[PDB]
Amino acid sequence: ASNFTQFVLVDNGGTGDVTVAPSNFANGVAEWISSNSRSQAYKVTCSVRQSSAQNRKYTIKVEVPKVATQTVGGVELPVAAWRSYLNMELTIPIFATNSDCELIVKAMQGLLKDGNPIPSAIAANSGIY
Amino acid sequence: ASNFTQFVLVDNGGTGDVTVAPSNFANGVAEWISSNSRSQAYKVTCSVRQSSAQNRKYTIKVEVPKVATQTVGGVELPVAAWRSYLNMELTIPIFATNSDCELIVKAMQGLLKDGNPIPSAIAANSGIY
Amino acid sequence: ASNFTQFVLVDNGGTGDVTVAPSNFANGVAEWISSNSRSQAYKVTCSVRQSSAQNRKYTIKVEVPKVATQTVGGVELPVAAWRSYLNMELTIPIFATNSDCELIVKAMQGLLKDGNPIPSAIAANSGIY
Amino acid sequence: ASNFTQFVLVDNGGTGDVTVAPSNFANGVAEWISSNSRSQAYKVTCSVRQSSAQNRKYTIKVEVPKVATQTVGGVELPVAAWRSYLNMELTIPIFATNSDCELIVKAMQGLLKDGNPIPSAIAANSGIY
Amino acid sequence: ASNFTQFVLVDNGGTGDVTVAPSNFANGVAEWISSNSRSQAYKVTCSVRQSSAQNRKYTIKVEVPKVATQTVGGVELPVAAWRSYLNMELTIPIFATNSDCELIVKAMQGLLKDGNPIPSAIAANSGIY
Amino acid sequence: ASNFTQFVLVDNGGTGDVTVAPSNFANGVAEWISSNSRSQAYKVTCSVRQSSAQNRKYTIKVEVPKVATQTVGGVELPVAAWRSYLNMELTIPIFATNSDCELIVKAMQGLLKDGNPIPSAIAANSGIY
RNA sequence: CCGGGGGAUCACCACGG
RNA sequence: CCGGGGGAUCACCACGG
RNA sequence: CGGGGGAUCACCACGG
To answer: Per its UniProt entry, which superkingdom is the organism in (chains A, B, C, D, E, F)?
Structure first.
């Protein structure tokens, strides 16, 4: 098949859903963007490299924009008031089997499950305590 | 409310679940670990700081053990061959409201939802194609 | 046990209460922040140190914001029109027992009790007369 | 009308109350002192000034003594074994209305309310934890 | 839960018991002190660090004071005639499981059990022979 | 009386107890070890000296083997991965009476009593939180 | 290339290795 | 950072790596 | 360490 497909980044229950689609693979960096002007789009990038002799490194990036309409020179333009940036690096040893890797994915999913500590703190503009 | 509580990191459907619990709070850095030797434990740390004048920044770290052919409670060397490391840094502009932050969390959840490109690639020991 | 938890900074009956929650505790400085936009949040910090041979010194800071919306270029952001800054330093000799400290706290509470000179002047943009 | 009057600094039920009375108001600095030996008295001072173009600044000071008798050469005098010194500075922009100031006072009162982190730590010779 | 709780350091059978409580966690050093003036208090501190790549180090400190009342400048002050200092470092490899660690705790407890060699010598102001 | 006798280091309720016995007295340093190869033994050494004019100092050392997955009588390398080291230094001012010293011992016993913070943390492969 | 609860305007930058 | 049956007024100091 | 020294508030300059 091919895993370079579009997926929904922000699930808002069928309405207001932010879906992101493949837009580039130049230089080994897979890119996805929302159906917007490049200045207001959601961006997701991913890449893998054999960082060392004995392990691989996945580098993922996500950009969440705060869309706005700005007036520059008396003209209105679609812009982003600001952006939130997520940068993550995952280092996996070459000795990890597929089951070993599913474990990693499940842990990451559990980490952000609704109601858990971390996602709770982030959504409330607070720390852990 | 007080979010520093134990939670399920790896959900294996009730049986075989991996729970992670509070183990340290030195220097504001919250830590959680599973019931294992520190060399084979699942570790999670989180912390927030004001990186700059306009940004707040969360640093989240997760360590996952290689389980295939593992010897529980044994000395496994080299350490690098038996562990995966996840480094996450989330930058959020100071103008983000709680709602904005909820959306950011949703985006993170969507990025790793089962069946999506990234988690599928990682779990299959592969890249994008 | 822990006193690094959330508390009510401004008691407005039981609804419009301003609550402040732990956010960061790095380098011996505990920091509390109210929810939502960090740009419009109340901030409280506290620290203790041995200022000298016989003295222990507390440094407390509080920031009260004037919530407002800033529109520029048609782009509006949540900001603080201005902030009120309170900085206080309390020195207590190492000979002070717990009873001595309870008294010091009572004095601070009395100084600001409703109806007394100091709080009355501040609440009215006035000085002493 | 006058707010330069005596008030209760330490409320000990209704008997061992520490009352502080006007003593001097020279050079824009109001001073209150408790009765009896000046050497063992509680002291409170307050002043306001225009720290800058947009800011008005309050400077408040409080001294809590540790009453004791000093014998030297067979001659005993009433003195203060030591003193606890509180110095606070409050800055309020000239745009603050009376309501804004009432709020600032509420915040100060809340910060020191019985049971909250700060007063609890001080009353126990402790810091934050 | 939280293990940062108060505990009794010196058990004297319900009467004359020296109990110690949490008082600080600044800079990752957990501190406990007895309910005394800071100049006469019992002190207990603890901290963990990943000393090397393959092991952790616990650093514990205990201070036992000999309380006295000293007359400085004709005034009486609560002081400590002298202090006994206990400094201990415990290095545990990361490969140690929880059971491996309970073993360490039991050994330390056995080492100081009433009647055993070491505690006997210490309490008699003598060496081993 | 002559305290250099064997004793129970690890009390496992009669069955599975670890006894440690006198094995060396070279240079005034008393040593005790369990019945194992020196690479897997429980070791205890103790010594007293006058560190300075006003202080006497006890140096106590304890070595505990990692037991999980251990191979009795086998060659286990690296040595650092299979052993925990405890270093204790107790400083007692020359004015301490036998009674004073008994209290010091009690404090040490209390610090490590079952259920208290420190032993609980160590046994759970964790820190304070 | 590796490191940091280093920074960013975010596939970039500085520092230390 | 590591070491000492190095020292302390005890989260510090000196020395050797 | 000082100031009824200032701030955009754990920063800044002047004083020892």
So the answer is: Viruses
Is the N-terminal amide bond of B78 cis, ω within 30° of 0? yes
DSSP string, A42-72: -EEEEEEE--SSSEEEEEEEEEEEEEEEEEE
Helix (H/G/I), strand (E/B), else coil: E97: coil
Mutation choice for D interface testing from E2, E20, E24 by most D CBs within 10 A: E24
Both tokens assigned to F41: 């033994």
d(CA E74, CA E76): 7
Closest-CA residue to B39 (of B78, B7, B3, B9): B78
Place of tokens 């009355």: C120
The shortest CB-CB distance from A101 to any of B9, B47, B123 is to B123
Task: Give the count of Cβ contacts less than 8 A between chain C and E.
Answer: 37
Q: Could you say which of C1, C28, C96 has the minimum Cβ distance to residue E6?
A: C1
Contact C19, C10 (CB under 8 A): no
- The first and second tokens of residue C63, run together, are 């920031």
Q: Both tokens of residue F85?
A: 């080291």
* A62 contacts B4? CB cut-off 8 A: no
PDB resolution in Å:
2.8
A56 touches strand G (CB under 7 A): no
Q: What is the CA radius of gyration of chain B?
A: 17
Cα nearest neighbour of E26 on chain B: B27
Show me where the domains of chain A are located.
1-129
Cβ of B122 within 8 Å of Cβ of A7? The answer is no
Q: Do chains B and C touch (3 or more CB pairs under 8 A)?
A: yes
Pick from A93, D37, E113: which is nearest to F8 by CA? Answer: E113
Contact E56 B75 (CB under 8 A): no
The answer to whether the CB of E62 falls within 8 A of the CB of E44 is: yes
Q: How many other CB atoms are there within 10 angstroms of residue D15's CB atom?
A: 5
DSSP assignment of A67-123 equals EEEEEETTEEEEEEEEEEEEEEEEEEETT--HHHHHHHHHHHHHHT-TTSHHHHHHH
User: What experiment produced this structure?
Assistant: X-ray
- From A117, which residue of chain B is nearest by alpha-carbon distance? B3
Can you name the residues that pair with F19 across neighbouring β-strands? F8
Distance from CA of C42 to the nearest CA of A (A): 12
Question: Which superfamily, per CATH, for D1-129?
Answer: MS2 Viral Coat Protein (3.30.380.10)
CA distances from F76 to B70, C104, E56, E107, F66 (A): 18, 61, 20, 22, 10
Q: From the candidates C2, C47, C104, which should be mutated to test the interface with E, based on the most E CB atoms within 10 A?
A: C2
Which has the closest alpha carbon to F81: E93, B82, B77?
E93
- Min Cα–Cα distance to chain C from D111, Å: 5
Asked if B91 CB < 7 A from strand G, the reply is: yes
Backbone angles phi, psi at E126, to 5 degrees: -145, 175
Phi/psi of residue B119, nearest 5 degrees: -60, -35
- Please list, residue by residue across A98-110, b when 16 or more beta carbons sit within 10 angstroms of its beta carbon and e when fewer do: eebbbbbbbbbbb
Q: With a 7 Å cutoff on the CB, does C79 touch strand I?
A: no
CA distance F86 to F99: 27
Measured CA angle at F120 (ends F119, F122), to 5 deg: 65
